[PDB]
Symmetry: none
Amino acid sequence: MQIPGIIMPGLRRLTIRDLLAQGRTSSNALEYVREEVFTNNAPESDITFSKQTANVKTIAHWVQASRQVMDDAPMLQSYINNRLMYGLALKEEGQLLNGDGTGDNLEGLNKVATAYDTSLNATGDTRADIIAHAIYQVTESEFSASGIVLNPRDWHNIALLKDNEGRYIFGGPQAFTSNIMWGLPVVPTKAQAAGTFTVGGFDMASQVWDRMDATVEVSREDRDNFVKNMLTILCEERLALAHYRPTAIIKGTFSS
Amino acid sequence: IMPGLRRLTIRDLLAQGRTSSNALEYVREEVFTNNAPESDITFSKQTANVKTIAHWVQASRQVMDDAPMLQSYINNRLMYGLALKEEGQLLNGDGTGDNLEGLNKVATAYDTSLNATGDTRADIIAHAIYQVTESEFSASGIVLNPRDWHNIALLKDNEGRYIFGGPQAFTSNIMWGLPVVPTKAQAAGTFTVGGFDMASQVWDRMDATVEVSREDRDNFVKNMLTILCEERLALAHYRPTAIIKGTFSS
Amino acid sequence: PGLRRLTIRDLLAQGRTSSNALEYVREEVFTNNAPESDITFSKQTANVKTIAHWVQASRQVMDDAPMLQSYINNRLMYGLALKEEGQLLNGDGTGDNLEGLNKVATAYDTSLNATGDTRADIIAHAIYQVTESEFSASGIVLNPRDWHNIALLKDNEGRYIFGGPQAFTSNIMWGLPVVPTKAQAAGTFTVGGFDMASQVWDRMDATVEVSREDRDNFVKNMLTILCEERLALAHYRPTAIIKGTFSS
Amino acid sequence: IPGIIMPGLRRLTIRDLLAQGRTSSNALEYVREEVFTNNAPESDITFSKQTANVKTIAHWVQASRQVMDDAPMLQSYINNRLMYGLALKEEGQLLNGDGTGDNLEGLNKVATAYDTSLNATGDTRADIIAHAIYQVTESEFSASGIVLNPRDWHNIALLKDNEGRYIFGGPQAFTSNIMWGLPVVPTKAQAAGTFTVGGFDMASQVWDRMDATVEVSREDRDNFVKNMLTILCEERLALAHYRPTAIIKGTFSS
Amino acid sequence: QIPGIIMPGLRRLTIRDLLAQGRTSSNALEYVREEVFTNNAPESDITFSKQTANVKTIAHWVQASRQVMDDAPMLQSYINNRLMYGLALKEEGQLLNGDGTGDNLEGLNKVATAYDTSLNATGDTRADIIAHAIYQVTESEFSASGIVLNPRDWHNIALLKDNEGRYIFGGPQAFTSNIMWGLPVVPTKAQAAGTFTVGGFDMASQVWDRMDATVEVSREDRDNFVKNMLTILCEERLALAHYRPTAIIKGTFSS
Amino acid sequence: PGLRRLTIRDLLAQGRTSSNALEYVREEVFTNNAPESDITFSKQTANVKTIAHWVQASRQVMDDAPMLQSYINNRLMYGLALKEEGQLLNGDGTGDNLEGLNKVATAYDTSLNATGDTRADIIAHAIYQVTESEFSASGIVLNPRDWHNIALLKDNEGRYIFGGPQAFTSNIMWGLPVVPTKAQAAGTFTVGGFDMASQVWDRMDATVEVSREDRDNFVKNMLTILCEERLALAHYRPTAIIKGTFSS
Amino acid sequence: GLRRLTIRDLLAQGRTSSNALEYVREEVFTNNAPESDITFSKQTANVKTIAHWVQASRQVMDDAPMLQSYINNRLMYGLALKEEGQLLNGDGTGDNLEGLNKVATAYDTSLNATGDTRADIIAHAIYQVTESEFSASGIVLNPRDWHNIALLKDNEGRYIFGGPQAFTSNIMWGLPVVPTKAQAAGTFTVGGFDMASQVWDRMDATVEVSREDRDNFVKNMLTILCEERLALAHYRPTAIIKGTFSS
């Protein structure tokens, strides 16, 4: 195997990747701190510290194809793009969002994020109100919300909604296509579960580290993939995710 | 240009690409709807040819002069017949002769045991999305007949209430956050759902071109030259299980 | 021209030609036949009719003054489009007139009018009737009056069918641009894929001429001002254009 | 004979709504599209000859002799006071113009009245304006600009929709904060409770026969004794109304 | 030395901004303002009475640290907010109302025309009181410009309710906009409670400027100088004029 | 960099110096009755204290990759200023801390609340006592929680005091810069003419240092990262500031 | 010294240039006779740091001879006795390492003779080790659990294997003993440490000194430290057996 290394991916949608601070690294794992912020009553509302450490996992996306033709037609160039890179990038969120943080899985935000305090929403509160409450809870962490992670479906719903008046709230469909909400960007992705929403100040909350930029490789000899004249194409990336302040994030579920 | 694209065609729904061969081989991820364990996926050494689709609309024999005049007719009136027509082979095809292996050809039959008592003309679709996940994939979008879409959108209960129905919805051509593609190329009552995002891409060999024959078939008899816009494509299937076909119990 | 609406001319494809007459085939589709569902061509021909707008004033002062230019260029010029949309929108293709879209347009299935529909629900059904041509809806054409109602139209729900009246502004109705005008008679409406259902060819640019002996200008000491525009309409798949009126 | 300099109020005026023009004649004629609010048929447009004449608008005010043309205090006296009032006075003519004498044929006078028969029951000031923007189309012309009084505009600027929600938006230079995209011009000329709209863009046009010139006196009346020099600033122009039906005038009948 | 530009807070437009702007070059200036008679229907013509305006000098003083002055960066930021903002509060006291004696100016209230008390009613709302003012402004066929009154009074005027919590035309926001009846408002403290002023200050009279606000620093000089350890100052020369006092109304809220 | 929320430091006048301390005159304005309402003077002086933000972490990554900058760059500073407001908003004049506005602010006039005034009606009256200083209000400071409730508040008539939940975003209230910060204790508010009543001077831009040498950061693989900043807060006319609380 | 390199001289050593180790751990399968094959389980090992600190004064201090002798003669060795803790009884969280005892395997009582001594048990352990297909290398005991053993006497009033004369240093059954206090009395451990696991030294022993540390600068007094960064691994857990004298 060798590397027809190079071609990068591009989507018209803002990946969770962009939502988190960008910083490269040169290691297999690093150690940081966790501002264990106590939703402490009025006084010593001070934030404890926690000696935590994160490991650099690796994400990969593969797919088989024919040798001859592939290795002959520019189909490859484009093959990896809309297929591999598109998939890999898409799968990436799967970890940065609902990561499991086990074996090769990254510690997903949601899995770390703090639950939603349903204590705030009160009678007669449209889903819009719910989010209004959310934006707040994310403040008790001394951090302001940055953006919202919502599922396409439930985004469509929230996007276009009146108000017991012909008034349309937020402007959808006009501004409904991702774009923004209340002024905070929205990241609609398949990964995000239905009815389940997550909001926080990812701007200053958590950060991502890169150990090796995504790269593709192909092996004419994998799994008897030689006798069946069908080499395999793979694209992997090395990185680790560090969740500084958890409370800076909240995960909830609309009133289903 | 072809931007009477007041909708997004399947071509825009599927994943784009491009090749230099006249045909290409690929591994069909024969995904079994295996039970919890294995339940494992299999692979098949398949392939995809390259057909040449084109649209034609015979015109009068004089317009041949006014250049700027002829120009747009082509771009505008003409592509659409191209792409529209193109959208056909992509959707469903006999996969024989010059017909591409349309999605329907390979699409997986819609499970009937999933149909309740007992379920609205839309609930059926709802189930589809789920059956799609039965292949370890998500839902890219839905493809159904432009009429049926009307019934779904402009639909109320015993009372006058637009359930996820809203003339607005039709305008958006999207439901459950999934892109809807109203195309008359597919018979009514029929519908297709799956993760086309990566369920199957398309390869572009030769872009749209234009050829006219005064001499050719009907143009003599039509008595006017017949324009023609060629195009060369290659449809592939990486996981047919990520595609479901069926109809509404009527 | 003007600065406000959106001239039907924008909806219909554009272009130009040299000959004063054109030829083309008409996809006259056999729409609703649950048997061989196809289309039959109809070799047609386009006629380059010259349209112009009348406008009097007085020449002698004017042929000296600079501003009159800033007049027809900005003002009178508009008077052309308004009159232009007229012929296109509809007219007896008799004479120097063109085949108006309404003339060649198709009827409107009243069967779709289900109990419970509103004057706003009508146009909705129309949108569908368009798909019958294999094409899709691009824009809608109505008059200020009806549009007004439809726009600022509440319901027993105690709310607007679209948001606040603002709706009226920036004619967009469910992602489909609207165009209010006088050319469209009251109660009458039209929809379809104008973008690709018909193409307009521009022969020559609008030319202007002035005179006093014109009409009864020799009695009002006012010189006539006119601007002739040679244009010609063409219809490909008329079945795409839907014509109809409200029940009220 | 004065050195010269131009002027302009802070925000815009009606002088910006009407299509600009100019002429070298003391007058000129034109034609009027008597548009009948004719029922569905022969809704045709009758015609009228009609004639426009060049009028003169000037503002004057007096001040010291030896203290005047001896200090740059002059310009400031014109640029801020004379000009300021000139353009301000100008609006009145265009807007509320009497016609007779040096008076310009006011728009409001020629403008078509409002159709009260066109309001429904639970209507607010906002709704009315909407109805207005509509009646402007019956003239085959689209709305183009709004003209209300500050004491009234300020009102519409802040309204709740039966819910706290602000319409047109919060107060933001509310005037600049033009409504329905269409521009707004709140002046003292227009009366309180009274408004005028229409397609000023094409409804009428303006012609400038002479720019703003200034002259002194020192000789006038009985000012030679009290040494009260009289400063005057005039200008020559003509207002022409083409399709009066393209402009509506109404009032919020309280 | 020579400065560039003032720049006060700008959270409210001072009378200066309300009045007509102007600039003279003479240490004195004459003018004619017709004394408009509140003449009955006929010869309601306005008499032309000659007048004369004196160019007074106004000084604004701010204590300056000796150290602060030496560095350029430290001194300037305080100063720009510092000179213009201080001046507007300062200029009022002379512009709004002054004996127009010694170094004072012809205060608006000084030449202001007393309110017509014979316009009041059984009990017009404290707001209607002002309403009459605007009307009387017509006494001189002049369109009222803005209204200047005491900040406190403004409060009571804004926050008004009927037998219900019905924030009258007024309300919390309106107070923020400082504009009622579509007319500018200048809630300057220079005005005492019950003391108000209405009229078309836009053209009712213009103020001329002789010399921009300068700055002088001394250690020994002034009462503070004894305090030490350094001094700062703003000299400015302006001239308030009045062509038609009838265009200005004073009066007082009694009640 | 990009904080979103408008920091006090953006509500108070700004300027710089080269010294370690400043002198000025505190216009002790008496809330003096109608007559000698004149303002006394006090020879006050400001001290250029020093504040910073420290964090501990294993240099394992802090010195094995240039991404460390990247951390201190747009991530930490944000933490600095975030604590910067601490001192300003309220700080014990004792020690390195600065003259906290609250510590220098004037009490609130309870005489203004009246049965029937809503949380919002209070802060309203507060804006008044600001005029007492002969200056007007420029911005308010409340705890995020408070701002919340205050924002989307309603009454019988199903309406918001500001017409929409959105009010929250784009902090504004009657056109007055609102700054929601944890720095402000709940049930506590503070208003005034911060614009022209208190200035801040810069003595040294934000700086950072690194030294494992500190405390026991050596025996334990770690490192203390921190970035000091030199400032000085002045209070010319403190009366221009009010503070008080609510019910809870 | 112990001259038995504590716990370290018993495990395969090596070096590393990272902070994490992704090794393959052979989850062996005693199982039964047939598919006695050994599974595999991706495992990760973090790199933790540990050092030994000792206080000292400077006047009597910065003497090259003295200093450069105190350290590599005493200090360096003293650190070993400390790191031995983590290796032996290590935890998995914080700055702790995955100690063998934590991954060790429970001793089979089943082999205990009707009537035998503590020494006999160890033998069983050795055998139980070969079960993992791997031969045993060393033994771990607690001084005292080594005391009685060294004094196990036949009612025949005579030591067991032991004679003051007939004897050597730490060694039993042909394998080292490495007596250590870090090991809880009663609880022992045996296994083929040779291939059982191996440690990786990210960096050799480094010694640094500081004055501004705590209250030394005042109490003129100094602090010397010997930082050490390393991490161990674990292959066949069944190779390490931990037992607790039920007696």
